[PDB]
Design a protein around this ligand. Structure first.
Ligand SMILES: [Zn+2]
Lengths: 170, 111, 1084, 104, 157, 92
């Protein structure tokens, strides 16, 4: 029943994202962190705000902060913790509506993945050889096959080392 | 080897520290009013405090390191997290809490 | 060729639309008018309705002042800055001794504007507001959907300004008033309102069954506060600010006619005002006689169209308050050195709650200035969507059975779409004049020179529907009139002496918007066909060539003009000019030069030009063309020939077939301008700039074209072609190993400034209408702080029409180029002329029916007959018309040949054979007569540039209309390979060059596993997805050569794991037989 | 196949004292045809001292022979005081249709 | 991130100052225009450096994985890496140990030790003399074999 | 569809099991040295494209067509998945 808690455990990688320009805006930051903070600050202010003898009342009212502060990284499901505080707005991405939730990360990277030689195009039709046959535009195509493309170009004329290859597709 | 049955479930606080391994606590300066990166407390690169001049001891071999100031052959330049997991320790020792204990009356309520 | 058809034209197309717009700016926004008049309305109100923010210590609100735009137009578009126009407002403070300091309007802040045009300008992005509607104030009562227990439903002043009261008729409490967010014994209310027992009961009216609480005028005061927010009576009635409805109608004139009589300026001011006229009524309403419990039922006599002059100005109140209790925090802190009616009111919380509006307030729908029209429509469109409560996609609680049709002809029923359907459309021509300020009002006719339009509410005395007549009086004897909704036969009111209090469509078109009354036989197709048309027109393209349709409605007399596409005039006349770019003047008020366009940027590509017309002196009254235009005749597409039938099915399902000649005379082509924003901030590690001395890669490929950074105008560009080469110091990945074995091997030493350039996106071969440079510290440069330079070069592209773009006509027929033909082929008319365009039936003709076609036959009476025509709606242009017209036509055509060389040929004749056996031609005179008929409706012979035979069958042909919408191809395509490769996501979506994607998310999956594409299915989530190493394992794999690229190793999952382990979990990637236990990933 | 002007940078760009507009211009130049005496001639050039106010049309170019212009009137320009126009058009002889690919 | 009373008390300044000049001008004053409002050392660059760090911006964090981008461990790059290397191994096939290894250790290709020419001279007996010649003996014999057989494209990576 | 495809699907225990076999005797096939398939003379498919010809580098199709020569079996045979490389020397 180690469900009682004494050591939340947040990672750090996902956040340290930095400056995005073009069109009309730049500046850059992340969430879960500023969301995380909530914690440590409290759990830090507690200790140094007790050691200096903070009798009753105070003590609990604080400490508990951690508690509430914990229902942070976890699930924002009660009164909310909007950013822009006071801020009457958005919901802190606390594994709710996002990450683990539905259609945010889980419902996303389970199937909502991505090919890498994918692509798209319009639509046509018209007698060819029908079946097994397909439109596909010279260029457009190419890339999809760019890899081997080089390869065949190897031993068989075209070019020498694949080194170049793309060097010719410029 | 080759994957199979996928286990999971708890990992008592005793465990926290296991993965936690170390690293954490302290403050979380989301950068300095100056040189953006680091802070020597938060997303601080594990054992990276301006010029710790250490930590590279844990690593057996592979390549050189220890460049005094700035940064050595650490992760900060390459292999930094490598999208891998990195656990934080949290200093958390204060009273209690609750991993949400969900919304079905378990890990309490019933017991 | 002014072939007039439309009989009896009276009123003019409500001169001139573009009201909803201005209607806000001005009629609602006093401003450029004395500081004395205009009751409250929009801004004048708020100010007073905004109590002089209390703490002596008393501020004051006195008079405004505006105009004086610090940045005149154009300038702004050369940069950004909305064409905002700052104001101020004198503020004298009150307090203790000699309380006054009447400061200089307290030099407030700026506020954007509206160009006469009929739209808005923001950060150089001419955008648009758009209207909002909603159940309008008064009282409803509503029809108890729960269990037949008729109650009531009280209004709000407007959304953002009041509580929603209700008075139930339940059981476990006979009437539980519902205060906005609440529910309680309404009886516990009236008590604390003087009227309690004896004073209210037996005078008017489950009653006081709880009369126990009808004793003291304060009982519930508190007693009530105990059940609301946590365990209020300042607002909700008392005073004026919350529960206060006004303006002059509904907000006010709600009771005065519906409740009985005895208005106020709110309700329950605690001296009750309406809480009596409401229940008194439901009491003599439920069971009594006065029914008229006519629920909104969406009826427009209960709905409100709101001109933006209340859309933001409302929120204006809420802002000049986000400053009230923002300044009150100023009357406490900061000694008097720092205290004055000029040291609190700061332009930091006001302009904000407004700029954070026009720029991203949804509705704003960055104007769709595509063609000249579309745009306009936006200035209309109209929606109950936005911030007012009627909102989201695909329902709340109810939305499907709701905003359906209605009882408002003052609106087209063919404009929405299919998704967030209904909740979007557009007003109509004759609609909203004089009092549009509250509830729509369509014009009406009354037999002679008089007019009325008491809203789209007039449902008393019925009306006629423009049909049959003769100098004020017809003879139908069965007046095709209308009552409310049904369509009773008639009852000719009797006296030409005015209509039955209003009766006459006044004109046909009045029923539809505008984006409608412009399609040919728009009385001959399914509604949804048209629909899928009255929106296609929303997306045209300046084919530069333009044409103005053989068929059409002179409404184009407006379309252009009132949208100010082309230009106009002024009193006197006589030109002179230079033409080139500018235009001569006039005579009246002296000379007057005249700018134009120069292609210019549109908000998507249009690139609008303005070639002109003239030569010497003529003043009616036009002046210089429009983008998509011809002599005032709103031209949009290119009406080349056409002809039903199939051909090698190169028109299956629903496709079109073009003829290369449709390129020869560059008929179909256009242009689009993409602004390319490229910057160079400057950290402190690396400083980014633009020296044309690009590193590493030095070649003629650069120095010749670019040079000194910027590239001269008139330079052809292709994919990857540097647009504004640049540098950046930057040292991210320092010196390589073996690489050194090269940096010298060839001796190109080393570099020191990562290439960082622009290089044209994936693909956009084009030209250059110019460039543009910018920089910090400059007076006019409103760049983002911490930066310098904001290169912004322009490029447009002489489009074309390859193989894929959408064509579509005016009656619903989306093209999709098949395989344009090289002359030789085609349908060679007996006289050479091949059929430039085809359009095989099936698809929507037989299917989802239409009429158009009459736009084909009558059509041929064009390339031949030589005249163009005007075809009104629900009037003129009919099945016999074309005949009388098809007439002289044949004699004509057949004429030539019969007097030129031939008359009847084996082929041309033979066919006629079947023509009979077929069940068409009558066995008459020589091939002449018969060959004729075929004409009339059907089309003359025709052969085939393929075999050369004839086309056994009275084929059909006739120049019509071809549009070629926006959805091109070179713009709607993204092909690639590895290209992306994004981080954090570790999944495709990354490239300072590329930028594609392609989801496989769900479904796409399923269908695949539906078979055994294991190695292929897994393949996705494996290498070609997020196997990282796997990634490289790939390219390398094949790049190298043969080999079943590596097995696999997920990742996004590896993420979830930790992502999960985030919380108190674990993920023993448990192995085989329990005890093996695998936790793979942990280093490798 | 290939034109030019002088004070004009590119196609999608205007010309002073010229209502036409480059686009327009070529879009009128396109339908101009000619004939070439001799088979040697691979393709020649044409000029035009289009000056000051006037009407401006085909036969107002180089009075060269060897290549006659079976198109007279052919409304080419329209300048009114913005005199200036001297241009370098390159006529070709081929077989078919060949737009923006064969840059003369 | 970190706010000593070095910026808040100063940002409140330019803020109250910009709001100060505001009511007494009519338009949002520029940056340099504020310089005078302030004083010594307060030019424009510094007035811009401050309101460039923070006050409460640092984005709102995540509206709309609100932003993409990338280039960390470039996929195609890490693939064009093994090539150049394995490519050199081949381009080094037509070399002599008394030059190949000489290069390896020299430029530091063997492992990563950019040994000086002395370390290369010690182990490799003979003093720099013939060695220095072997050094340049390479380059040419390494570049000469290029213009006649492409490979001058590996430089772009 | 597939050349002879009809002689496949049935001549097995069920769809997949077929496709399966195929893509193995492919890499294993050509990818393990072009000269390996069972076919002998010209029955070995070709690609008479432009002016010149050559065996379709798309190995995958050999196997399909290779399953038309009595040769080759399929099933739990020779458990040494490794020893499939026991030939990896006899064919170099
Ligand atoms: Zn170090």
């Amino acid at each position: 029943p180690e469900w009682m808690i004494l050591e939340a455990v947040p990672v750090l990688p996902p956040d340290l994202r930095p400056m995005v320009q073009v069109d009309g805006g730049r500046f850059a930051t992340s969430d879960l962190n500023d969301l995380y903070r909530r914690l440590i600050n409290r759990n830090n202010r507690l200790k140094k705000l007790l050691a200096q003898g903070a009798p009753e009342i105070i003590i609990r009212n604080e400490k508990r902060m951690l508690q509430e502060a914990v229902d942070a990284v976890i699930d924002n499901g009660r009164r909310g913790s909007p950013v822009t505080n006071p801020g009457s707005e958005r919901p802190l991405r606390s594994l709710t509506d996002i990450l683990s939730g539905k259609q945010g990360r889980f419902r996303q990277n389970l199937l909502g993945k991505r090919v890498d030689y994918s692509g798209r195009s319009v639509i046509v039709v018209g007698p060819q050889l029908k079946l097994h046959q397909c439109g596909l535009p010279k260029r457009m195509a190419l890339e999809l096959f760019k890899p081997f493309l080089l390869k065949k170009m190897e031993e068989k004329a075209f070019a020498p080392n694949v080194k170049a290859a793309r060097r010719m597709l410029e | 080897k080759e994957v199979r049955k996928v286990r999971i479930a708890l990992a008592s606080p005793e465990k926290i520290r296991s993965w936690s391994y170390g690293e954490v606590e302290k403050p979380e300066t989301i950068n300095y009013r100056t040189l953006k990166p680091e802070r020597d407390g938060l997303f601080d690169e594990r054992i990276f405090g301006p010029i710790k001049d250490y930590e590279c001891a844990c690593g057996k071999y592979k390549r050189q390191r220890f460049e005094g100031k700035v940064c050595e052959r650490c992760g900060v330049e390459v292999t930094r997290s490598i999208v891998r997991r990195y656990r934080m320790g949290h200093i958390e020792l204060a009273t209690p809490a609750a991993h949400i204990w969900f919304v079905k009356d378990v890990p309490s309520k019933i017991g | 060729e002014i072939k007039r058809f439309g009989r009896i034209r009276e009123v003019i197309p409500l001169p001139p639309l573009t009201e909803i717009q201005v209607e806000s700016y001005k009629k609602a926004l006093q401003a450029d008018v004395p500081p004395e008049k205009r009751e409250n309305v929009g801004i004048q109100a708020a100010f007073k309705e905004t109590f002089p923010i209390e703490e002596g210590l008393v501020l004051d609100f006195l008079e405004y002042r505006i105009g004086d735009p610090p940045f005149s137009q154009d300038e702004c578009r050369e940069k950004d800055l909305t064409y905002q126009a700052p104001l101020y407002a004198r503020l004298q403070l009150i307090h203790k001794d000699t309380g006054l300091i009447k400061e200089d309007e307290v030099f407030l802040g700026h506020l954007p504007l509206m160009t006469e045009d009929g739209s808005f300008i923001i950060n150089g992005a001419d955008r648009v507001i758009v209207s909002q509607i909603h159940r309008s104030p008064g009282v409803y009562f509503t029809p108890d959907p729960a269990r037949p227990g008729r109650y009531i439903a009280s209004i709000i002043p407007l959304p953002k300004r009041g509580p929603w009261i209700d008075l139930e008729v339940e059981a476990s409490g006979v009437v539980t008033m519902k205060v906005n967010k609440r529910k309680f014994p309404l009886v516990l209310l009236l008590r604390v309102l003087g009227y309690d027992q004896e004073t209210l009961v037996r005078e008017l009216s489950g009653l006081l069954d709880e009369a126990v609480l009808a004793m003291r005028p304060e009982e519930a005061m508190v007693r009530l506060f105990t059940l609301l927010r946590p365990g209020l009576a300042y607002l909700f009635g008392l005073l004026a600010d919350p529960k206060r409805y006004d303006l002059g109608e509904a907000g006010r004139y709600k009771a005065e006619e519906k409740l009985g009589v005895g208005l106020s300026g709110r309700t329950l001011v605690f001296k009750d005002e309406v809480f009596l006229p409401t229940l008194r009524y439901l009491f003599a309403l439920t069971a009594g006689v006065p029914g008229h419990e006519v629920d909104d039922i969406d009826h427009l006599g209960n709905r409100r169209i709101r001109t933006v002059g209340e859309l933001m100005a409302d929120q204006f109140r809420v802002g000049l308050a986000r400053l009230a209790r923002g300044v009150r925090e100023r009357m406490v802190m900061g000694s008097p050195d720092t205290l004055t009616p000029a040291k609190l009111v700061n332009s930091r919380p006001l302009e904000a709650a407004l700029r954070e509006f026009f720029s991203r307030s949804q509705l704003s729908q960055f104007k769709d200035e595509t063609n000249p029209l579309s745009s306009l429509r936006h200035k209309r469109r109209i929606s109950a969507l936005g911030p007012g409560g009627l909102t989201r996609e695909r329902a709340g609680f109810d939305v499907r059975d709701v905003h359906r049709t209605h009882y408002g002809r003052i609106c087209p029923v063919e404009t929405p779409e299919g998704a967030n359907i209904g909740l979007i459309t557009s007003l109509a021509a004759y609609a909203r004049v004089d009092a549009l300020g509250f509830i729509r009002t369509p014009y009406r006719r009354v037999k002679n020179g008089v007019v009325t339009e008491e809203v789209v509410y007039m449902t008393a005395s019925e009306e006629d529907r423009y049909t049959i007549a003769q100098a004020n009086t017809p003879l139908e004897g069965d007046r095709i009139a209308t009552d409310r909704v049904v369509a009773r036969r008639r009852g000719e009111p009797v006296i030409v002496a005015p209509e039955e209090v209003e009766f006459m469509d006044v004109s046909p078109k009045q029923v539809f918007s505008l984006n409608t009354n412009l399609i040919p036989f728009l009385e001959h197709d399914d509604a949804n066909r048209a629909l899928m048309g009255s929106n296609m027109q929303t997306q045209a393209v300046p084919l530069i060539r333009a044409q103005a349709p053989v068929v059409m409605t002179g409404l184009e007399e407006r379309v252009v003009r009132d949208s100010l596409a082309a230009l106009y005039a002024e009193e006197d006349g006589e030109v002179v000019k230079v033409d080139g770019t500018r235009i001569a003047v006039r005579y009246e008020d002296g000379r007057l030069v005249h700018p134009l366009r120069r292609y210019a940027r549109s908000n998507q590509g249009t690139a609008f030009d303005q070639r002109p017309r003239v030569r010497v002196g003529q003043r009616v009254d036009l002046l210089a063309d429009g983008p998509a235009s011809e002599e005032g005749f709103l031209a949009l597409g290119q009406n080349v020939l056409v002809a039903i039938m199939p051909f090698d099915g190169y028109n299956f399902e629903d496709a079109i077939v073009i003829s290369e000649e449709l390129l020869k005379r560059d008929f179909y082509t256009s242009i689009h301008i993409e602004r390319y924003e490229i910057e160079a901030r400057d950290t402190k590690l690396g400083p980014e700039r633009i020296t044309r001395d690009i590193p590493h890669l030095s070649e003629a490929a650069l120095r010749d074209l670019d040079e000194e950074g910027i590239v001269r105008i008139g330079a052809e560009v292709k994919p990857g072609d540097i647009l504004v080469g640049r540098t950046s110091f930057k040292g991210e990945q320092e010196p390589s190993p073996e690489e050194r074995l090269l940096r010298s091997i060839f001796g190109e030493k080393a570099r020191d400034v990562k290439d960082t350039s622009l290089r044209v996106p994936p693909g956009e071969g084009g030209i250059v209408v110019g460039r543009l440079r910018l920089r910090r510290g400059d007076p006019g440069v409103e760049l983002k702080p911490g930066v310098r330079e904001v290169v912004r070069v322009f490029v447009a592209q002489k489009r074309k029409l390859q193989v894929g773009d959408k064509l579509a006509n005016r009656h619903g027929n989306k093209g999709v180029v098949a395989k344009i033909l090289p002359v030789e082929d085609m349908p060679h008319l007996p006289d050479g002329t091949p059929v430039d365009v085809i359009l095989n039936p099936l698809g929507v003709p037989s299917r989802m029916n239409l009429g158009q076609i009459l736009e084909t036959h009558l059509g041929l009476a064009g390339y031949f007959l030589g005249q163009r025509y005007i075809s009104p709606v629900f009037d003129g242009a009919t099945e016999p018309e074309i005949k009388e017209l098809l007439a002289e036509a044949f004699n004509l055509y057949f004429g030539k040949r019969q007097g030129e060389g031939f008359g009847v040929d084996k082929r041309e004749k033979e066919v006629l054979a079947r023509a009979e056996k077929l069940g068409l031609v009558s066995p008459g005179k020589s091939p002449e007569e018969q060959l004729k008929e075929l004409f009339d409706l059907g089309k003359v012979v025709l052969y085939d540039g393929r075999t050369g035979e004839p086309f056994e069958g009275p084929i059909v042909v006739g120049q019509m209309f071809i549009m070629k919408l926006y959805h091109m191809v070179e713009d709607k395509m993204h092909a690639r390979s590895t290209g992306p490769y994004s981080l954090i996501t570790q999944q495709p979506l990354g490239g300072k060059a590329q930028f594609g994607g392609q989801r496989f998310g769900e479904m796409e999956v399923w269908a695949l596993e539906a078979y055994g594409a294991a190695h292929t299915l897994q393949e996705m989530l494996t290498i070609k997805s997020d196997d990282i190493e796997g990634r490289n394992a790939a390219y390398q794999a094949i790049i190298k050569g043969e080999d079943v690229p590596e097995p696999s190793v997920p990742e996004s999952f590896r993420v979830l794991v930790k992502e999960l382990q985030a919380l108190a979990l674990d993920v023993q990637t448990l192995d085989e037989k329990d005890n093996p236990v695998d936790i793979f990933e942990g280093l490798a | 196949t290939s034109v030019y002007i002088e004070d004009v940078l590119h196609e999608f760009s205007t010309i002073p004292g010229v209502k036409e507009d480059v686009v327009e211009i070529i879009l009128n130049l396109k339908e101009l045809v000619v004939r070439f005496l001799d088979p040697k001639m691979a393709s020649t050039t044409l000029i035009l001292r289009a000056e000051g106010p006037k009407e401006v049309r085909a036969g107002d170019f180089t009075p060269s022979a060897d290549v006659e212009i079976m198109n007279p009137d052919l409304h080419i320009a329209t300048l009114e005081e913005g005199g200036k126009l001297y241009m370098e058009v390159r006529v070709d002889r081929g077989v078919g249709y060949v737009p923006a690919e064969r840059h003369g | 991130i970190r706010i000593p009373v070095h910026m808040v008390e100063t940002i409140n300044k330019l803020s109250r100052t910009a709001r100060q000049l505001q009511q007494e001008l009519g338009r949002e004053p520029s940056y340099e225009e504020i310089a005078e409002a302030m004083g010594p050392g307060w030019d424009a660059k510094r007035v811009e450096e401050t309101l460039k760090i923070a006050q409460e911006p640092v984005s709102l964090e995540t509206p709309i994985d609100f932003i993409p981008d990338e280039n960390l461990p470039s996929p195609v790059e890490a693939a064009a890496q093994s090539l150049l290397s394995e490519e050199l191994e081949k381009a080094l096939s037509k070399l002599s140990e008394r030059e190949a290894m000489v290069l390896k250790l020299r430029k530091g290709l063997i492992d990563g030790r950019e040994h000086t020419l002395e370390e290369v001279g010690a182990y490799f007996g003979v003093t720099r003399e013939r060695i220095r010649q072997i050094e340049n003996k390479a380059l040419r014999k390494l570049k000469y074999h290029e213009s006649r057989t492409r490979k001058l494209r590996d430089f772009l990576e | 569809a597939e050349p002879g495809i009809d002689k496949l699907f049935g001549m097995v225990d069920s769809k997949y099991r077929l496709t399966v076999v195929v893509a193995k005797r492919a890499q294993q096939l050509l990818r393990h040295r072009f000269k390996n398939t069972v076919l002998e003379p010209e029955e070995r498919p070709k690609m008479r494209t432009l002016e010149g010809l050559y065996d379709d580098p798309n190995a995958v199709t050999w196997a399909m067509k290779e399953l038309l020569t009595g040769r080759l079996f399929f099933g739990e045979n020779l458990v040494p998945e490794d020893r499939l490389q026991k030939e990896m020397e006899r064919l170099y």
